[PDB]
């Protein structure tokens, strides 16, 4: 139990983005460094108490 | 016009059909079929593109 | 690399600094985006399989 007294901060990544004001930016051909890079998504969309 | 107009209405009707009876757990589907089609630059995939 | 302000840790953050040259810039002016500017639409042919119900689309 030694483990859970103190509580342990979760880091929270600030909100920030500038899709809105420069939607060119954002087109229809996008940059990614993995091709299995919308795996994890289509996972939770179909089965989300796995 | 009038011919051209309703062969134009004809063929997207009909594949709308067919694109609403996809999961969207799959590569091409509803939201992301016109993105991997599209093999130029333009500003924002909406209008005559889709 | 270690850095301190006001007693506490001072950490760097952001996009990794790489080293910018000459060339870097000026052989996408070499490329130009040399890609002919023209909408080309790829076809996707519909596969059936056991189900019916739901539709999957391929790459040919």
């Known amino acids: 139990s030694a483990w859970f007294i103190n509580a342990g901060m979760v880091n929270m990544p600030t909100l920030s983005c500038a899709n809105g004001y420069y939607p060119a930016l954002t087109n229809v051909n996008p940059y990614h460094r993995l091709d299995t890079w919308k795996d994890t998504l289509n996972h939770w969309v179909a089965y989300p108490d796995m | 016009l009038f011919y051209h107009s309703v062969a134009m ?42 | ?52 119900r739901v539709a999957a689309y391929a790459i040919p």
């Open chain 2, 9 to 50: 209405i004809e063929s997207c009707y009909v594949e709308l059909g067919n694109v609403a009876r996809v999961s969207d757990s799959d590569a091409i589907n509803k939201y992301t079929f016109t993105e991997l089609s599209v093999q130029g630059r333009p500003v924002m995939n909406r209008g005559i593109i889709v």
């Open chain 3, 1 to 52: 690399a270690a850095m301190f302000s006001r007693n506490k840790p001072l950490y760097m953050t952001g996009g990794s600094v790489r080293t910018i040259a000459t060339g870097n810039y000026r052989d996408a002016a070499e490329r130009l985006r040399a890609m002919d500017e023209t909408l080309r639409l790829k076809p996707f042919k519909i596969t059936e399989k056991l189900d019916f």
